[model samples]
Target chain A: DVQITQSPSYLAASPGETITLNCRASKSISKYLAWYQEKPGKTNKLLIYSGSTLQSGIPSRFSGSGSGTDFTLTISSLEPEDFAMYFCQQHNEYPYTFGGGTKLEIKRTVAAPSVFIFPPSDEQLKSGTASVVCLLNNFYPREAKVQWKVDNALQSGNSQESVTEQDSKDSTYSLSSTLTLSKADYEKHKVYACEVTHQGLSSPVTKSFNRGE
Target chain B: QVTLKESGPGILQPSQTLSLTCSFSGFSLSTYGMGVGWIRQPSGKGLEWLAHIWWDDVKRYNPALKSRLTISKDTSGSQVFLKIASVDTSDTATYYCARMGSDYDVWFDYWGQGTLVTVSAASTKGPSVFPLAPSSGTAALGCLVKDYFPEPVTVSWNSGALTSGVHTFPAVLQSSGLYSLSSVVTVPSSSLGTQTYICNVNHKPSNTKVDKKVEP
Candidate 1:
């Protein structure tokens, strides 16, 4: 039942710059604070829990520190992917409450690629063969890497990846990669994952599809 | 092996009462010194602690919701019940039932899947204005809006056609299924003598569009 508040509801930062976000609790919440990163149209990612403990797989650049009523989430070096919304939550008491979110925006003129996945079409599913496309668009510095996974396990397959194409008007690049699967792969309800890695991203941008869908 | 499930109406009319049941299994309600509580989240929003009933049958609630919330338990059936009088769109949220540790440990260890409840056709009231003492050479003001039905109101401030540096927070829901939104405006001492600040609120449920002005 403690009230949580965040300051500077919005922020603009450039790559290589350091930024800090603050969270304040109405009463002492000990070290039960947790921080999360939310990107547009993506699920929230837990960055820090138990006040200062970083969740597994999170990079060292992202760190949380504080106790009691005051807490802070600091990004030592700003990366393109790090520019997104962040929120803090207190788990010290019942009815865990979250602070108003702070949005970290990229201030530079360069744009990072936004990744999306197009699920297998109904016709492809009925035909016993499925084709999924991973679209990476509106990205600068066209160099990128694409990987595929099945049921969370990384895999290599006969896939087609397009050369990055630069948009005439904006000078940004767009690319698409397609992965095909056989009827056997679609027979069972398995998850298909596509991960894109780029210099601008602190971590890979991952998108997933399900056979049931 | 403990599991929790929530059951309640999917929709409610404005000013209607709301009743919800939390049925649990795989553990005895009287054993382990455990308690049951209710939590809710608006769509794509954060969690709100509604109320809780302890194993000893004692109840506690969030002060903002204490007056209109009721928490009760049926030990024989291993279930908890939550009733909120005078529901509105502000009450539309996904309700969850959870199990908590004994005594001072209020953290929830187990949770139900949650049930979504929608309150429709709720309107809003006036956004009253109040003046606060200026600090650090800035004129300060506060605005309060009350008794809003069917929540999710947009509250903003305007100084003529200029709209920047005005800080506002989200509307808070009260226990009575009403909403209260407060905003603060800080203007420079130089402009305080002639500037007119307006608190503009827009709630679509009742098609409400009103503005309250404050002059320093």
Candidate 2:
């Protein structure tokens, strides 16, 4: 098995600036190399294959070139959406190995989010329809996932719309997610769960709401 | 009907050789005027193209695997064979035999059931050593060795302290994909020697040697 190393484990770049990521194989692998993109809240994407062939839907600005043990992936004109994680994989042999991984992030470090969940108001509880709110605050790189769970089950209602805003005093981001449900359908212990996921943390943060005390 | 069946030793040890046979019933590889080759996939990973062979006795192989691979055919028996040398744990996978239309065609329409071969490695760390700790004695000296890949190692004892009984236990695989083993030598009171016990480990793959000093 071959060992692959990626340089610039962490890169600081910005929009409109060009950047290149490097990958090296322990042994020569010809042109059987591919690059992929991993972004916040999105599944990984294949940007290039066969060394230099761009994946069909990949933008022309994103390109690859190299062969044998050395390979590079270049993004000529970086877009705001381009600040993400990139890695390379060599398929020239079995045990298809991958690079150590490079995280292309913004010039300034982004802050981790502070998550909050508010229980439904008494008026709405009496009206039979209740709304639970989850607020994620003081985060940057501006991507997140908020899901609502009833009991132990993840509810589709988490797909309910959310609002994101930038703080007037700070450059960080904050998002509010609302989940609507029948008040009588809620649980007593650990009833409403607001699970928040952000690039800032390796594990998701969850807040619980319970009533009928 | 062009029928093909694959046969091979499904289980193999590390550093072994493999020969897979793709036998055809109604078609002759020498006269069929088509291409035959092998492709393999790990348990859940992507497919890998090993090599391809045409009817005219010409062949092309995956560059990375070229040195260790050999593809041949038996003209009258209507059979094609694939040979892989010096196989390792990563070589474990299901080998599929398929035929292309003509020349270096774009696709393979006829495929065999495929033979599965598993090459067992002690650990991804390559070899797992055992006897982490030796029995304490003024007569026995032990050393615990850990974490070296490739499974090929040389353990030798050098000491003016003891005579007879230089034994190294088999390495055992660990969850972390590394290997661990232990080596011990006997220092009988009969010889009554001084403290000159050393454990030398030679791992050729990483191209380095590690030595440890031990006593009763």
Candidate 3:
């Protein structure tokens, strides 16, 4: 039986530093070796295996070389898009073994990140006239939808507005909906939500921030 | 069409080992990755991955089987065998045997008809003892690369101090400069835990290095 171990449980590096991790087998597993990259909450992607053969569709910068008991997983030139956890597996033995996993975290020493807000707050709703807006980030194609609700009931709305950004650089855009209610109705009702739907893989990630009295 | 089937004593008594073999006929044994695999499926249940061998390579198995499981092949009769040590009723299941290729590392591209092995009440048949050392077993380590130069690559053993038992196997070169070099070394269990195996790819620009240390 071959016992597998990977070194450096966690790695910290600059954007360009060539990082390397080691996967060792206790026995001479021969030509049965493969490496995989796993991102949190995502499917693992085959990286290098069969003793250094890079899997197709993998980025050029990520490469593996070496054979036999000792194999090295190397990241030639790290890019901003190349940070993730990496692992190694030995195919030579049954009950395939995997490395502990190495996490690559980008260093951030700058100021706090920005936050986006939509759908005016309770203070705004209390002002008699109520308005709300919702924005979806980093979603595209035929996989997004926005709907407006009022007073815990699906109500007919006067008008709805939707917009999206085209520049690939932006990668995301915003959508908004306006609900008009008389001052009396606005004062009496305290519920409104913007539900967004998306497709592709996995369930849609939804965040709902409510307005209260 | 040629077909293969695995059959052996299913139920093994406590402290006894379960031994099984995958026997086949009507196919080229050397063409496919000819090795037998053992899988456990509880009675009336689906198949579960146990352990398997391709030539000498071993694949996933229940950790419970590590100390007791041994997968071996018979070259003459085109059969593969599995021996499990210290078996109990929990070991009851239908075990399967399959054939694969060197390139098909993850899945068994070729398959064999499966057999069910069960473990039950203690029997008069004594425990099946496995040889401490297997004879005529071949193991190879491969170093595959995109640009394999004509210059020969050497795979060596550095066991704290270099050992002289290392043997180099011929390299397999494929299209587009992609190449796979392999090497085999034989050593008894005495040196098993102390050896450091190295795969060195010698070429211009940058030579490659990979190593694995042995453990008992």
Candidate 4:
């Protein structure tokens, strides 16, 4: 039950640049720390475990080396896909804990929108009304088109959109849009999609939401 | 191929019993050699280790919750169960089930998506500041904030005009219903002036701010 503290909560790095992230445990955790990469919309992938051992199939450019209370995750040559949120977790003690995430974003002239659809709440489904929210985060240029579609057809009704908010740290923008629909639309197996078109995107980024029990 | 999934009630009344189950696949509950356990993170709070069932069926719990907590396993169903009596709002948190490493080399290897459990109503005192120590030219300061109820407090540091590298660790809760938080702030090696580092703790419910200063 050690507390993990991670530094540089946010980092902006470019391709081919080297970056090092730090994780410190409240007490000696030996070499029990693990580093994980969490890309947007994907499950977390273990990069290094036991402080320094790289997980199988992970690129050699990514390395970890530390022991006891201090650990570090170093990316020797950051790749384009390496820009994502990274976290460190300790397994040396019972009730293992993770550090606050360190977000490694690509330092670029422009960033593309990472879109996500929040799942509907149980009450919304039970009450026959769904308020679906689409989040457009970590995008630059601010000006982006967020379109809503139902069952592959463009639909526009009862929608609420947020003004783009700029991140002071990275100058990126994040905005959310909510679309309300009848529960019947979901019961009928209709697909809901959030399509985002940004300057950096060659094609619109679309995320779909489907009803699940 | 091992997977762990946690399932439990979403809400519970004060003083009610809380029950949760962890279903496992690609591993056996009886012969995993490792252990299974539950860990929780309160809403907007740091993680807390609740309890775990060892491979030998020995239940070990956090001293704070040991009196009311029980961890057991069902080998036939390949599941583990967690039960706690007399739950309060302070117990509301997202509970996750995790797979442990070997008994000697203990650590969670795999974790399940957490299931949130909310409690209705429940209900800490002072900050004991500790001396600041030098860790490789960095100043590390810690304090124990005592007797807080509902268990939420914020700890921060203030070093006037010196924006050194500062990192705050997650707060650790003690069995005495108190919380302790520590932080490290780096100072320039060549600075030769009177230096003062202050630990500022804000208790939200009471709207109180306590400040403690140290010079290295």
Candidate 5:
């Protein structure tokens, strides 16, 4: 039976550091290696295929090397978003096989952000619109991105957003995101979620706003 | 129509069995490649994967809870069942049952409203008030009242006594001598419209009263 082996089941790295995630096969599979990214609440992200071709829209810093039985996914100048589980697969064999995921976690020295979301406004609804607000409070280093999901689906266009500069004495940051949609749209889609991604944390912070929650 | 809903007692005492059921639609438990699993979130903590069982009765459990956790399924009932034996306060959390995808990480494709379970040790304490699944058809909201020692509590909706179109089940005494109650107030979707619905509970014991608010 052919097996895909991933090394360093758990590795901790800091932002901006380059890392090579290693994967090997029991025997030669030529250049059939593929790598994928995994995160909770997200679909698997295909990163590299055919041992070296970066998937469309993948950053240039991500590159694959080596061939035959041994392969490597070398990610350089890692971003906080890069810290996630990764695994490799091979389709050359009849029965496709995958390696156990290697979790690339981050170790940092900053307070992770606390997230909260407010429900839609009555006034907005009265005006045929609904607006929900999301707050990211007390996150450090001023590095975070806000994303909204309507009914668990990501929105390509960001809503109105603002960042509060950190107090000079206190070393934390805050951000607010407001999502405005038609009252009719809001009624059709009842759940809105706000997620904040930061490099200092292992995973993004997400909060859901259910009309009835 | 692929969906999952969880049903189980919302309250328990120490050393009790937490019996939870995941009722699903649009899939057959007997179908190969179908799987169900239990996940949980502790208060002030992150999510944890507890257990999962495949259609063939293959089960996988987190090492942390494997010794005390069991997952089983009834294809005949289109349901999956999970039981945690000898549950302690540590098991007190919102438990969610998910219809798992047939891929790596076994991502959750459909989910339940997640019944909140409280493992109480006190003989006399305030109730843990939380929301239950919405009304079956018209989005009538519900709440599971549990962990209260004494009974005969008052339930109100929108800050007023709901005299009609609401049903609060009679208190059922737990093996631990506590009581659990359920209230499913089916306000016609037209009744409340877009207003936030509030559920309030109060009694003389523990001088305890709190509000559970939800909106549609």
Candidate 6:
């Protein structure tokens, strides 16, 4: 079986201790080194590649270097946010594999961050109608653009809408647009979306409201 | 037969979130079983599976993907898209699209050419130290250590004090089919002042042990 091994699956380092986690491929793998930090529920962010080069928007403290069968994931400095599970994967060959994971536990860990959803209530849709409303509470930075649709049709002439950041201390932003549809439109369709956009970020974030069976 | 492409910035600044998207033409969410997914490649790296989308009565995502991902499908143009939240410099990579299948298992079968997403947002703290420089005294030589096989083995330290920090080594498989591993430990200047360190090898099935100690 193709395999990846991570030494000391669990690690505890002092605030200033230089820590190194090893990721090895049982067989030779060329130019396929990648790292990601795994957090519950959220996506795993890719940290390193081809051994080095930080991904756009990632911090400088995190660097990946090395090549061939051996590679390394490094955190120049270990910060509070850095305390999460990190895993390495090899994509250089067929049948991709991942290191079990190395959890970055604090010398004395603290509570994990919390998540909040927007609008707090499900949008109500009349029978046979399709409408769109912003699910405003879940994201951070609030830097998103939202739009509305009624009965499968894009609702043009829609007004711009906005929402505040989840935590007062958070600089992340969010905004949305909605389209209210008539019952006739609802019965004609099964779903609608409040589409959101943020610049430089990949695709827009969207929250879909599906009709009741 | 529509094609989707992902495009984003190429380098990530530590602590900054990285996000990218897949844009396409040819299919509508209303007609096909296709759902969008994200795959990544580090600067010179291979492929990594990120997330995927599926629809029951409503669209649902991989539970592992809940926090940092969002998926939306368009009926107007038959397009499916993705969004990632709380991106850090590490989130950089080439994000791509894969068609969704109907099976309960959510997998990305058909893939797109990857788009590198680099995160370069600034943070208060600067880069930290790399481990190699500070610890080198306790390094282990592969030739001095005995080889074991057909059973699990472990490395034990005999310095009396617990051996800490990163250990690196190189090893060779001998003609007899047994392998030798060479290792090095970068003991911090403070820790290196100690007398000596031992490398212990234990073979599980035969119930045997071998050990050796070395100084800088």
Give each model's whole-structure lDDT. Answer: 0.69, 0.65, 0.51, 0.69, 0.69, 0.49
Summarize candidate 1's per-residue lDDT along A78-143 as a digit string, tens digits.
776776678887878765687878877665455666665655544445656555556566676667
Stretch of 10 with least lDDT, candidate 2 chain B: B127-136
Interface RMSD of 6: 23.2
Which candidate number would show the highest TM-score if scored against the true structure? 4
Stretch of 10 with least lDDT, candidate 6 chain A: A113-122
Q: What residue runs in model 1 are displaced by over 4 Å at the alpha carbon? A: A7-22, A27-65, A72-97, A101-213, B121-216
Q: Tell me model 6's lDDT, rounded to 2 decimals.
A: 0.49
What digit string (tens of lDDT, one per residue) describes model 4 on residues A101-206? 7887665578886566654555436656565666665677657888888788887755556543234345565665666667887677557788889999998889
lDDT per residue for candidate 1 within B95-123, as digits (tens), equals 88877644544545566867768787543
**TM-score, one value per model:** 0.42, 0.33, 0.34, 0.54, 0.37, 0.31
As for DockQ, the candidate ahead, 2 or 5, is 5
Model 3 chain A worst lDDT window (10 residues): A108-117
- DockQ each candidate and list the results: 0.05, 0.01, 0.04, 0.05, 0.03, 0.01
Q: For candidate 2, lDDT tens digit of each residue in B1-216?
A: 766677886566788898899887656666656777787767645457787777888887878889999998876637889999999978888787766534543234456756667686443332222222222223444454555554545677663333245445555443445554545454544433555567777765455576665532
lDDT of 3 by residue, B1-216 (tens): 545677775344576878887776665455555544455556544344567666545444577657777777665637777888887766766566654434347533334545544454522221111111111123222122222433234445553244333323333333423333323334544444444444343332123444433222
* TM-score of structure candidate 5: 0.37
* Model 6: per-residue Cα lDDT over B1-216, one tens digit each: 546666554444555445566676555445445565666655434445666554332455435556776766554634556667777655655576655333333333344555545464421211111111111223311112323332123455563354443132323333434433323343444555554556565543335555554443
For residue B149, give model 6's deviation from the true position in Å. Answer: 46
Clashing pairs in 5: A211-B215, A212-B215
Residues A1-213 of candidate 2 have per-residue lDDT tens digits of: 777889988786766788999999999988878787765324346688778988767899999999998999999877656766787777676545667688776543577776656555554456575556555656886778888887868888333433332332333555556566666665443577889888888898898756653
The Cα error of candidate 3 at residue B125, in Å, is 52
